[PDB]
Amino acid sequence: QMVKYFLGQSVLRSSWDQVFAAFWQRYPNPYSKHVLTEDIVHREVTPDQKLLSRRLLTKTNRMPRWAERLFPANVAHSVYVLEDSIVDPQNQTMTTFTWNINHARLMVVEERSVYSVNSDNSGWTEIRREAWVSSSLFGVSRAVQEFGLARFKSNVTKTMKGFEYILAKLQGE
Amino acid sequence: HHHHHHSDQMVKYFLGQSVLRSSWDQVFAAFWQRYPNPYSKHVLTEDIVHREVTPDQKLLSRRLLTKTNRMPRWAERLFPANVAHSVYVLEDSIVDPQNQTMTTFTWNINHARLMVVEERSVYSVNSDNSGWTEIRREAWVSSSLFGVSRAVQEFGLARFKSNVTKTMKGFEYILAKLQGEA
Amino acid sequence: DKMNSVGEACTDMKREYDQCFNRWFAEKFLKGDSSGDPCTDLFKRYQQCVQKAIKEKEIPIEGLEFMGH
Amino acid sequence: DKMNSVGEACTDMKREYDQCFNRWFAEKFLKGDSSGDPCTDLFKRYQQCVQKAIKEKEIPIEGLEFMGH
Ligand SMILES: CCCCCCCCCCCCCC(=O)O
Ligand SMILES: CCCCCCCCCCCCCC(=O)O
Ligand SMILES: [Cl-]
Ligand SMILES: [Cl-]
Ligand SMILES: [Cl-]
Ligand SMILES: [Cl-]
Ligand SMILES: [Cl-]
Ligand SMILES: [Cl-]
Ligand SMILES: [Cl-]
Ligand SMILES: [Cl-]
Ligand SMILES: [Cl-]
Ligand SMILES: [Cl-]
Ligand SMILES: [Cl-]
Ligand SMILES: [Cl-]
Ligand SMILES: [Cl-]
Ligand code: NA
Ligand code: NA
Ligand code: NA
């Protein structure tokens, strides 16, 4: 586990058609102040009557203070997020895939969600939500360790050659 | 001679064994005289900053070295603040002539958020020949970047969960705004 | 009350395409009505603006497979 | 052919103390001889210079247990 995996489940006490409509109208809302920008950057209806959309959000970068001090070059930049979706009215399902496309060296959060008719109540909507949190910094830590070990081993050779040099010089004054 | 290394827990552990074809007393004397030498151009500065003899006739010393900071370029870009600084290294030693052993413990005291290399070495009379000296060398290579990687990941997960709550409350706000018009 | 586009010059084109798209979505699409897209012309007008704004801001959205890989 | 001290003004003092110590180490200490130390006043003068230089350069050597224990 360098990648953290999340699995979640939610119920919206509204019907699937209301939820699917609300999906496109939910911004702005009182809980979305961190969402600054919203655009559709691609949209088509497929032959099997599926709606394919790609939505671009810009969001505020809000980092704990310690990460601001460690990652100064990231503090100034907003987060850009793509949300791909497939809306399928024939099966009353919607599938979404959301991930940040910048700050990607620092961390990537990917979310895959499925919206469907609540199995207990046909008037409600369940959401099954999967997420993966990854950071290329684990690979950087390993590269730094491997460099440290390589330099240490090289310096051991220099240490011993240096010892042999001075002992030969001292043996006979 | 031989050596090996492997992980400990995101710590890399090294164990090495070598021999000097010189007697223990010559090696212990040479320890103090080995700088400078043709293989030590990266060692810029050398000082004793503590030294005493114990009641049991052991020599305790602390030697401070300044060493050149030579990082690969990818690491310079990642760690701009580390490029201008040499490496400061402390070497603590106990010389025990009654038992013909010397023990050293060497580590960097700066650049320590980026990595720490700790080396523990024991010099003793070689078991096979009285005119040789053997060295048992252990080392630990660690980096606080692993703990940083985990902390970044934990803040990403926490912020994700918080955004899920906001997403759901937002849905509930707009559903109620939509179900109040038709 | 409404969101801004990532291109300021595109916001009012966005507000008008979204508003049209929502009417078509609820009334035709979700109901299975297969008559073609109503808001087509509003969309490529809107697109023309935002796509330029995206390149201008160097938002790196190109070459990204749909729904991830 | 001799090492510099981290303190620029200290290097000759370091060099004079080191070779006094080398002689005492090899000829007395390593042979179990307990004639104290003949280099103490070289050492005290040398430490005054170098401990000063370590503070001015803010080298962080304080508070560090011996042999990392
Ligand atoms: C310091 C910022 C780096 C990472 C930005 C994370 C943004 C999350 C992208 C995936 C969002 C899933 C949807 C959601 O949050 O509700
Ligand atoms: C980028 C600087 C990172 C840390 C520097 C490593 C210094 C090594 C300290 C331990 C030295 C043991 C002796 C040796 O390396 O030969
Ligand atoms: Cl605020
Ligand atoms: Cl976010
Ligand atoms: Cl940075
Ligand atoms: Cl239907
Ligand atoms: Cl970025
Ligand atoms: Cl890397
Ligand atoms: Cl190297
Ligand atoms: Cl020395
Ligand atoms: Cl960093
Ligand atoms: Cl930095
Ligand atoms: Cl440092
Ligand atoms: Cl931390
Ligand atoms: Cl026209
Ligand atoms: Na506010
Ligand atoms: Na950057
Ligand atoms: Na149907």
Residue numbers in the entry:
A (entry chain B): 12 to 184
B (entry chain F): 4 to 185
C (entry chain C), D (entry chain A): 12 to 80
The authors write:
TRIAP1 (yeast Mdm35) and PRELI (yeast Ups) proteins reside within the IMS where they regulate phospholipid metabolism. Thus, lipid transfer proteins of the Ups/PRELI-family shuttle phospholipids across the IMS in a phospholipid specific manner. The partner protein TRIAP1/Mdm35 has an important role in mitochondrial import and folding of the PRELI domain as well modulating its membrane affinity. The Ups/PRELI lipid transfer proteins are widely conserved in eukaryotes and can be classified into two subfamilies by sequence similarity (Ups1/PRELID1 and Ups2/PRELID3).
Similarly, the human homologue PRELID1–TRIAP1 mediate PA transfer within the cardiolipin synthetic pathway. A construct of PRELID1 in which an unstructured region from residue 173 was omitted and Cys112 and 115 were substituted for serine residues facilitated the best soluble protein production (PRELID11–173) with no effect on activity. The structures of PRELID11–173–TRIAP1 and PRELID3b–TRIAP1 were solved by molecular replacement and refined to 1.98 and 2.91 Å resolution, respectively. In contrast for PRELID11–173, the Ω loop and the C-terminal α3 helix are much more closed than PRELID3b. PRELID11–173 exhibits the most closed of all the structures while the structure of PRELID3b displays the most open entrance to the lipid binding cavity, and this likely contributes to its ability to readily accept the larger headgroup of PS. Mass spectrometry (MS) identified that a fatty acid, likely an endogenous E. coli lipid molecule, was bound to PRELID1 and the abundant E. coli phospholipid phosphatidylglycerol (PG) was present in PRELID3b. While efficiently mediating the transfer of PA, PRELID1 showed a low PS transfer activity, similar to Ups114. K58 points into the lipid binding cavity of the PRELI domain and together with R25 make a specific electrostatic interaction with the negatively charged phosphomonoester of PA. K58 was notable in the PA release pathway as it maintained contact with the PA headgroup in the secondary site.
